RNA sequence: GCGAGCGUAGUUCAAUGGUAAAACAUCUCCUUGCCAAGGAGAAGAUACGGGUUCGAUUCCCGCCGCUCGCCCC
């Protein structure tokens, strides 16, 4: 028969209460979600038992729609599990409960895909899945870390099945009113009383004079509760207290300034309560409980390390830390090893080595003792030192001898260095290598060692015998568990050589690289069925490979009546949230109706197609209505309501914003050189610029932001010179990406990157090295990649003044200069990127750092130009003078004459000098610099050789320090030779 | 508050249970006199305290200050 939601409580509650957990009644006071129940929130913390079952709604008025949508309801119904202490069978008894919930493991795709949650209200965070059944988002599974303040001890399991989509899913109704309540009566005939004026009365008509001052007092009441000791009706008035905030947001009376008051109020007061429980308890005596706590030849060696699913990101790194870490501690301990190579699975990270020898190298080393003069005297027995040494190593003092280094030339034994068994040393050493990975995340199961996910099962094997070595609380033995549910639930390897074949022989393709040649050998396959070919990304199937552990393709169809929607937006359906393989035709390459799916292990066919087409087309339903209802009006009415999106808590909304871009527009495009005649269409632009971030299409996906914009400009019937500019005012939007190639996208690109960092610069929001505020170095890259990689001639320090101009709020002149150098600073790291020496562009940027297309037009080629090999003799001449101008600064005051001048050799140099400076001018290039510079050299020799530039009369020697001062300034405007690695 | 990483000439850096190395800068000098260019020398140091050992820049502990997460935000 087909399940009913009345005994589906009935069949979810009688089985958690044969495993020993105690059900209980739902919550009293509306609840926003299933987590701020007394019943969890407030119990998890202290050392006490607990295993709890319960189903509650829950009431969340943000999410109100008028219950027409079939996906988001105002009511939903949750089932709530928390097991503490975790017994070890945490996501088993899932599976088991599933089971008999009524359908079948066998023929159902149940995978867990990573997910953390974490909510700052009342501050908690943890580590878990979700778990994905033929692509429903059906359960919530989360180990906890930390809930209020306090950390968790022991850590809690939590399991919240969402009971509302798991019977739509399983009868197959398509609606949510279709949902049968019991045989005989439905769902939606019976809970659309409690929908409907509910949504009226949180949409419209709730009166905003009582909630805001009911808000306050009930936040003074808990205080006033809390400060008396007297921690349950405290906590009780915190939900009532947070339903009002919610259902003021749902109004639409909060801006975006009170969030963070209320948000820091309420949390505060969250925290503020919870450690009182704690205090509260301990008093009592914790009346629950108390929880507490002969030469052979060489074989192979297996280590494997079998924890639960970890995320497609960490399996390539452990199983990297692991392998490089351990070629190295048996080099350390004198092992001969040959090949090694590890796998990584999301379940196992295997390394096998592979002739490990059975003894270590029995060999003698020679020590370094010391010194010969002090451990031995002129006369009589060796001092102190050597008997010392001799004692210490256990070795005659006869077996001293000299070698010659060094001063004292040295004192030397032989010892011998006590080969083991070469096990007993993997026995000592394994506990450290295993320990020794580090991950970006970590969690704790049953005791203090980190790890990213717990680990279940050490199989350690070297030949025949085992490796005896417990961690984590798990002694490592000779069993391995292959898919779960299968025949081969547990087998047992016998000997460590016949391990690799075993595991294709319980259908895991263990190998990193060979899952991929299995994927994309049989996807394309499954194409030429109906004539196309699939789309590929490589951080698409970097991700599907490490979701697997036993591909298995399988193709499904949907309806062509999605074909009308952008072709940006099914492909991003399908890649960002499913992730399937969409297929595009050889001929006419636009999208076909079909995609392709990877199931896992050996399930049935039909069954997964079926339910999965379900899904794909339920997503595409709310995505046409969202873009139906958001094509009714042009792109010219939302350019007014954006303003419910901040930019800056100081500076004010995006409307401000594009309206500064539009003013300041005009002057960056006169900077640039752009033709007059194309100023019209780009003050048109700037009209339009960025108003798709508040259309519906892009609320919720985020990463068609910039695309959609043009869209509908396309739609709306304007010219193709405009929409390219309204698309590429985000490029570049990730590294790698594409850059502007279109004029008047280029002008409103570096507007926006000049007036986001002018902005972000007055309040004074430098990120430091770790953290990204608002990836300021992000945009900086952006803004000079955009001016070397087109060519244009530019002023930074220029248009930089006019930028901030149009702010609101007065910016003094030191902000402009810390910009200035910021992205002076980002423009050595790009270039230093492509192989040009530190100290050539450290040397030409602290002059040409103005326009950064000609510092790298510049820096690029006098690199080059440094192998002529007269490069250090032109570095030598210039600055030979330079390092003489320094300390007496009296021939500042005049310049050259012809009425002192001394003998010849200083009228040849000078006239020499005022032939060359003729050709130096700031606006020249460095092409012919060396090749005019080069006829001065000559005379500068004679010179500094014949006229004693010593200070001897003080007119001779101004004048000669005014000459030499101004032969030497001719590179000022060109490049500096300090930083040049020749001098 | 709570973890890690650290600390050696003025700067940059070598090594290991044992008489502390090298560049650069400074200085003293030899070339025809001042800078460049060839040579010789000089001085220059283990953040600080204790413990054990014949003997630790090295092993253990205390403190000083720096840098990074977390706490706060």
Redesign the pocket.
Same mark, same amino acid.
Do not use: C, D, L, W
């Given at each position: 028969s087909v399940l009913t939601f009345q005994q589906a409580i009935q069949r979810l509650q009688d089985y958690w209460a044969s495993v020993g957990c105690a059900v209980m009644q739902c919550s009293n006071t509306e609840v926003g979600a299933g987590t701020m129940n007394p019943l969890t929130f407030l119990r998890v913390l202290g050392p006490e038992p607990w295993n709890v079952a319960y189903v509650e709604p829950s009431i969340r008025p943000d999410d109100s729609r008028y219950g027409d949508n079939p996906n988001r309801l105002q009511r939903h119904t949750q089932f709530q599990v928390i097991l503490k202490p975790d017994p070890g069978n945490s996501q088993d008894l899932f599976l088991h409960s599933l089971s008999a919930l009524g359908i079948n493991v066998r023929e159902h795709d149940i995978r867990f895909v990573e997910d953390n949650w974490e909510s700052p209200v009342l501050?908690a965070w943890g580590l878990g899945w979700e778990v994905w059944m033929d692509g429903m988002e059906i359960t919530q599974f989360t180990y906890f870390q930390?809930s209020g303040?306090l950390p968790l001890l022991p850590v809690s399991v939590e399991i919240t099945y969402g009971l509302e989509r798991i019977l739509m899913s399983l009868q197959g109704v398509d609606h949510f009113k279709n949902i049968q309540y019991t045989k005989g009566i439905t769902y939606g005939e019976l809970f659309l009383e409690n929908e409907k004026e509910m949504s009226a009365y949180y949409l419209e008509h709730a009166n905003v004079d009582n909630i805001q001052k009911h808000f306050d007092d009930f936040e003074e009441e808990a205080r006033s509760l809390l400060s008396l000791w007297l921690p349950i009706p405290a906590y009780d008035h915190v939900l009532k207290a947070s339903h009002a905030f919610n259902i003021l947001d749902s109004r639409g009376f909060v801006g975006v300034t009170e969030r963070?008051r209320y948000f820091?109020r309420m %949390?505060?007061l969250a925290?503020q309560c919870a450690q009182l429980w704690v205090k509260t308890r301990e008093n009592l005596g914790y009346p629950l409980g108390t929880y507490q706590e002969v030469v052979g030849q060489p074989r192979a060696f297996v280590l494997e390390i079998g924890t639960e699913e970890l995320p497609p990101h960490d399996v390539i790194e452990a199983t990297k830390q692991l392998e490089k870490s351990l070629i190295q501690i048996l080099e350390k301990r004198r092992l001969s090893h040959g090949k090694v190579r590890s796998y990584g699975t999301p379940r196992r990270l295997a390394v096998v080595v592979e002739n490990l020898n059975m003894k270590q190298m029995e060999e003698e080393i020679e020590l %370094?003792?010391?010194?010969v003069?002090?451990?031995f005297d002129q006369e009589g027995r060796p001092?102190?030192?050597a008997?010392?040494?001799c004692?210490?190593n256990n070795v005659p003092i006869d077996s001293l001898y000299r070698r010659t280094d060094?001063?004292?030339e040295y004192?030397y034994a032989r010892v011998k260095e006590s080969a083991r068994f070469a096990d007993e040393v993997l026995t000592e050493d394994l506990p450290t290598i295993i320990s020794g990975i580090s991950f970006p995340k970590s969690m704790r199961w049953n005791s203090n060692i980190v790890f990213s996910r717990p680990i279940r099962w050490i199989f350690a094997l070297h030949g025949d015998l085992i490796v005896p070595f417990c961690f984590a609380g798990i002694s490592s033995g000779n069993q391995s568990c292959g898919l779960r549910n299968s025949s081969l639930a547990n087998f047992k390897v016998e000997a460590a050589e016949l391990y690799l074949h075993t595991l294709e022989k319980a259908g895991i393709l263990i190998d990193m690289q060979e899952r991929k040649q299995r994927i994309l050998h049989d996807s394309s396959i499954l194409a030429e069925g109906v004539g196309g070919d699939i789309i590929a990304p490589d951080s698409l199937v970097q991700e599907v490979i490490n979701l697997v552990e036993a591909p298995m393709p399988i193709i499904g169809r949907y309806d062509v009546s999605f074909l009308a929607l952008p072709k940006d937006v099914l492909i991003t359906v399908m890649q960002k949230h499913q992730k399937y393989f969409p297929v595009t035709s050889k001929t006419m390459g636009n999208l076909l109706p079909c995609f392709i799916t990877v199931a896992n292990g050996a399930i049935k066919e039909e069954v997964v197609r079926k339910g999965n087409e379900a899904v794909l087309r339920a997503r595409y339903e709310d995505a046409k209505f969202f873009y139906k209802m958001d094509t009714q009006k042009k792109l010219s009415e939302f350019r007014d309501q954006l303003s419910s999106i901040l930019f800056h808590e100081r500076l004010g909304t995006m409307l401000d914003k594009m309206k500064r871009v539009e003013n300041t527009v005009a002057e960056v495009a006169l900077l640039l050189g752009i033709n007059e005649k194309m100023i019209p269409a780009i003050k048109d632009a700037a009209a339009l610029a960025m108003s798709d971030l508040a259309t519906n299409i892009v609320t919720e996906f985020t990463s068609l932001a910039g695309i959609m914009a043009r869209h509908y400009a396309l739609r709306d019937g304007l010219s193709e010179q405009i929409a390219e500019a309204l698309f590429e005012i985000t490029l570049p939007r990730f590294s790698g990406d594409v850059f502007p190639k279109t004029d008047p996208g280029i002008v409103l690109a570096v507007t926006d990157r000049l007036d986001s960092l002018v902005g972000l610069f007055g309040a004074g929001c430098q990120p430091?090295?770790?953290?990204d505020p608002f990836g300021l170095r992000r945009i900086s890259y952006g803004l000079v990649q955009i001016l070397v990689e087109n060519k244009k001639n530019f002023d930074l320090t220029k248009a930089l003044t006019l930028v901030a101009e149009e702010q609101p709020i007065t910016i003094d002149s030191g902000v402009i200069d810390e910009v200035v150098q910021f992205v002076t600073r980002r423009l050595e790291q790009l270039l230093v990127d492509e192989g040009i020496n530190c100290e050539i562009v450290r040397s030409v940027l602290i002059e040409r750092a103005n326009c950064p297309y000609l510092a790298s037009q510049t820096a690029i080629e006098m690199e080059a130009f440094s192998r002529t090999e007269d490069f250090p003799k032109i570095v030598?001449?210039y600055s030979?003078?330079?390092?003489?101008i320094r300390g007496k600064e009296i021939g500042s005051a005049l310049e050259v004459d012809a009425s002192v001048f001394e003998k010849d050799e200083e009228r040849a140099l000078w006239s020499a000098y005022l032939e060359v400076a003729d050709k130096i001018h700031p606006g020249v290039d460095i092409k012919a610099f060396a090749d005019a510079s080069l006829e001065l050299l000559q005379p500068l020799?004679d010179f500094?050789?014949?006229?004693?530039?010593?200070?001897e009369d003080e007119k001779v020697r101004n004048n000669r320090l005014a000459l030499l001062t101004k032969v030497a300034s001719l590179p000022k405007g060109i490049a500096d030779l300090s930083v040049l690695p020749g001098?």
């Open positions: 501050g930390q303040s963070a820091g %949390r505060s925290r %370094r003792g010391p010194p003069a002090k451990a001092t102190k030192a008997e010392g040494f004692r210490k060094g001063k004292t004192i430091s090295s770790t953290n030598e001449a030979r003078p330079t390092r003489i020799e500094f050789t014949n006229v004693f530039v010593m200070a001098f």
